[PDB]
């Protein structure tokens, strides 16, 4: 034999697949570098040819067993080609799932919200709303943008998400997997090696363990940020409560980077800025690539092929042609690699060059491996290599060495603290979010959370794990998590966790091979033959062996570790502990931004009516909201001499209980930021309590 024709078929398939993959890569590259519709079909059908190999996979599902393939490489290729994917589903259900995915992507891409007073112009997400959430310092504008995007897009995306989870769970179950979360976790699963095994379930607990070593540091950071926000929005944040969700620098809270301008430890002394000196030296956007390649080869890495220099999309010509130049390392193959990234004169592009060249160095290091094994160990390694490369290339001693950052300057530690906090606002502000989101998705797929408690669990975990409180209550008609890009478009989110750890581990081990003395964040990598050899003893491995062996070949560890990150951020930890003498480190999960003006209501049907008492459902809640709106209308008309059109959408309700007890508050009709104070609501209820009571057959005690 079986192994013989197994190998022979693998060889034949590799021969017939490499050439067409090469052609498809050329077609895609030509599409990307020059946006012409005329050749799009010319490449689209080309992709169809690659889809032909899909049916060829059908030839390895019937007669090829599993337990008889003792050898490792052939087994790995066979199981990498054996999976059916979504083909096991029926045709009608398959087309239903495809149209659901397309509908969700289209709804996310072309959703619009606009002002309550000038509805003639509306805003998309990527321009307009993102700029509002990143730049604006107005509480009301941020609240409006947050709540409006939530309302429109989430309320559109909820039922499609329900059907999507049902169909995906069915497809995963019919594919020898427990649930869809199990299918996603199967990427890390390693078996049949007797000593390096890694179960699918185990990963879960490992992640949890890691978070247990992050909660202290994050807590301190959280507290610090809270204090620095109290000046920006006074009388809006409680010092012993969670942070409001719309003040975190962007729409969802994935990163806290945009808070940096508000939370500089020492704003008088700026950090390193060298693009002015780079402009003064008058270097074209070609020499920086050569210098970065020289730095890459100085550590012992192999020289870069001439083909990359000969043909590449390096700098935009600036002619009438307007094509997207988003950074990307193209690995068409057979020694043909390219870089697609628009070059400016900034630090950001200078480091992105290092990131992309680390990507391509990784990708080209293991070109000898088979085509099916031509990928990184898992989803976290490929970006981790680039991250460590960029981190090593950004040290101030590197700037001093490369001729920039003139020697007449002393590296004071205040700028180092500024840099450490800037790094922490990005690296450390996203781990709780990623953990909580993937946990929510895992429990939703697993069936732990019922379909009537998605939002309840979402906001409970938000208040408990991340310490972030919603500014307005959100019932079960919302689908806030589906408003993320990665959730609606069916993408995995756990990689951004594991990668965030892996890189730091590498950043220790390699920088330990260079015999560093001072702090970790100030150490370098250049000219370290032993470190280069240690890295290359993992780069060329690819997918041929389990990722545990690859990790051990660099750090000597069998799993992910959190210690190197804490050693990286130790100086900032000490400074934060010193700076939080008076602040209450932690948060309380009972304060809400709207909880000051709420009114509690308790209803006792069995006491008032005894027998023949009606049941309480959402229609009774609708009637109660209408009654409160009527009362508020009457009070505003008959006393303040104003006519205001209150509705049942202006009465916000929270904390519904089987006792029939809940809190509510009232807002102005077309303004979520305007809340009627509790005194006016009390006066209106006093005025119209008799009608409110007799609408429900209850009398002032029930």
């Amino acid at each position: 034999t079986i192994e013989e024709q197994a190998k022979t078929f693998l060889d034949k398939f590799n021969h017939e697949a490499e050439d067409l993959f090469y052609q498809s890569s050329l077609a895609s590259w030509n599409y990307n570098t020059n946006i012409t519709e005329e050749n799009v079909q010319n490449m689209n059908n080309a992709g169809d040819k690659w889809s032909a190999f899909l049916k060829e996979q059908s030839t390895l599902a019937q007669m090829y067993p599993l337990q008889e393939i003792q050898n490792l490489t052939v087994k790995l290729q066979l199981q990498a080609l054996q999976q059916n994917g979504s083909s096991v589903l029926s045709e009608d259900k398959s087309k239903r799932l495809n149209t659901i995915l397309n509908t969700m992507s289209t709804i996310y891409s072309t959703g619009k919200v606009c002002n309550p007073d000038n509805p003639q112009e509306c805003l998309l997400l990527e321009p307009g709303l993102n700029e509002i959430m990143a730049n604006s310092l107005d509480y009301n504008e941020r609240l409006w943008a947050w709540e409006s995007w939530r309302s429109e897009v989430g309320k559109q995306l909820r039922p499609l998400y329900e059907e999507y989870v049902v169909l995906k769970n069915e497809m995963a179950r019919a594919n020898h997997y427990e649930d869809y979360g199990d299918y996603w976790r199967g990427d890390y699963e390693v078996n049949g090696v007797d000593g390096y095994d890694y179960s699918r379930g185990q990963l879960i607990e490992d992640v949890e363990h890691t978070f247990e070593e992050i909660k202290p540091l994050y807590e301190h950071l959280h507290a610090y940020v809270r204090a620095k926000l109290m000046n920006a929005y006074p009388s809006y944040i409680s010092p012993i409560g969670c942070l409001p969700a719309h003040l975190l620098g962007d729409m969802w809270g994935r990163f806290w980077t945009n808070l940096y301008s508000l939370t500089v430890p020492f704003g008088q002394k700026p950090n390193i800025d060298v693009t002015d000196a780079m402009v003064d030296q008058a270097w074209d956007a070609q020499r920086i690539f050569k210098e970065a390649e020289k730095f890459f080869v100085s550590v012992g890495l192999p020289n870069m092929t001439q083909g990359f220099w000969e043909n590449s999309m390096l700098t935009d010509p600036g002619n009438v042609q307007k094509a997207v130049c988003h950074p990307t390392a193209w690995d068409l193959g057979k020694g043909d690699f390219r870089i697609l990234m628009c070059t400016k004169v900034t630090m950001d592009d200078f480091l992105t060059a290092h990131h992309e060249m680390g990507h391509i160095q990784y990708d080209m290091a293991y070109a000898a491996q088979p085509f099916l094994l031509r990928n990184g160990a898992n989803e976290g390694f490929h970006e981790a290599v680039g991250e460590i490369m960029s981190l090593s290339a950004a040290t101030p001693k590197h700037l001093k060495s490369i001729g920039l950052l003139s020697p007449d300057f002393q590296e004071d530690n205040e700028t180092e603290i500024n840099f450490l906090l800037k790094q922490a606002l990005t690296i450390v502000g996203t781990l709780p979010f990623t953990y909580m989101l993937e946990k929510w998705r895992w429990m939703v797929f697993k069936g732990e959370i019922p379909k009537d408690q998605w939002m309840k669990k979402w906001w409970e975990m938000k208040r408990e794990i991340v310490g972030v409180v919603e500014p307005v209550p959100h019932d079960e008609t919302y689908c806030d998590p589906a408003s993320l890009f990665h959730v609606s478009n069916d993408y995995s989110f756990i990689r951004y966790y594991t990668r965030t750890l892996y890189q730091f581990q590498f950043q220790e081990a390699l920088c330990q091979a260079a015999k560093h003395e001072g702090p970790l964040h100030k150490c370098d990598i250049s000219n370290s033959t032993e470190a280069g050899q240690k890295l290359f003893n993992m780069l060329r491995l690819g997918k041929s062996e389990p990722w545990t062996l690859a990790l051990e070949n660099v750090v000597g560890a069998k799993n992910m570790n959190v210690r190197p990150l804490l050693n990286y951020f130790e100086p900032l930890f000490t400074w934060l502990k010193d700076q939080n003498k008076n602040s209450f480190v932690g948060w309380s999960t009972d304060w809400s931004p709207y909880a000051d003006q709420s009114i509690k209501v308790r209803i006792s049907l069995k006491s008032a009516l005894g027998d023949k008492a009606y049941e309480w459902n959402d229609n009774e809640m609708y009637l109660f909201r209408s009654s409160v709106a009527y009362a508020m209308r009457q009070y505003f008309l008959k006393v303040k001499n104003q006519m205001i059109l209150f509705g049942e959408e202006d009465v916000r309700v929270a904390n519904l209980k089987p006792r029939i007890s809940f809190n509510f508050f009232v807002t102005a009709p077309k303004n979520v930021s305007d809340i009627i104070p509790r005194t006016e609501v009390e006066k209106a209820i006093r005025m119209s309590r008799s009608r409110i009571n007799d609408a429900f057959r209850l009398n002032d005690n029930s």
């Binding site: 308790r602 006792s604 049907l605 069995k606 006491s607 209980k657 089987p658 006792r659 007890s661």
Partner: protein
Amino acid sequence: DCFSTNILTLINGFDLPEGNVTQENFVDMQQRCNASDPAAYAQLVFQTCD
């Protein structure tokens, strides 16, 4: 009336359904309530009447 007042105090304290606790299933529900959420029941002042 004293027993009814005690039942009402417990129900308002822990927001159970109104018709779930009665004259005879009061002690077991009280035990369940303190086991479930300790240190919040202690805020309740319970009177004894026999």
